[PDB]
Amino acid sequence: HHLEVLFQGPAELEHLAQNISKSHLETCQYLREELQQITWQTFLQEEIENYQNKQREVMWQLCAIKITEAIQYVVEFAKRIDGFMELCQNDQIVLLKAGSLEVVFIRMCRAFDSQNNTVYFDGKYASPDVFKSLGCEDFISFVFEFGKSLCSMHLTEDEIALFSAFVLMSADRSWLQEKVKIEKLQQKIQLALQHVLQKNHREDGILTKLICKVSTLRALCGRHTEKLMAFKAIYPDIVRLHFPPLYKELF
């Protein structure tokens, strides 16, 4: 009893860390190790040429399909975050609309080869050149730069899990009803994230460097929306008839 009391604090942090870490583990398609083992499998020059030969709307539709697949996993992750299912549906939707793609871009660092500037896409590791047909060179550059930036931190799976849960449970999203409840949940997550970070590298104070990225994510995801809207303006029927419904619902 007395021992249990002496441990209650750190125990709680560890319990929350382990819970989120498990949820992350169980909602990623591949193990970190599996992705790392195949970074050499880049697209062949002919394959790259084939993607570049695709028409803008074709490449867009493909990217939307693949993003949506990743988002599905993120939705499963969200469902497992304690507190998330207790929120009103309105807030669950607001949080997912804003944060699902943020988590996708965080998860990207696991499937990103920083040394070679490539990302796991459609079966193999893709350089920026693979995405030329989108007509979004600056955005693609931004994505890969973010990949490199986040990779530079050498985040563990648990760190990614907790950081993902942190940006998802953001109390400052527009239009939230239960801001105070969400804020309290995020605070608890931040403490567990800090707990997990200084367990590996008390060499620095990277928590702030991590939270610094929070702003970049928002900008990156903001750009994605802006571009999707411009694309939709030009190809309304492609979006209506050929884009994944979940993607349309979210964005």
Ligand SMILES: CC(C)CCC[C@@H](C)[C@H]1CC[C@H]2[C@@H]3CC=C4C[C@@H](O)CC[C@]4(C)[C@H]3CC[C@]12C
């Ligand atoms: C204008 C928009 C649609 C262009 C988006 C193009 C690129 C950046 C998108 C298309 C498909 C996306 C990938 C789809 C699936 C995954 C698997 C997930 O476990 C980590 C992120 C990762 C690897 C995504 C990273 C970003 C990605 C490669």
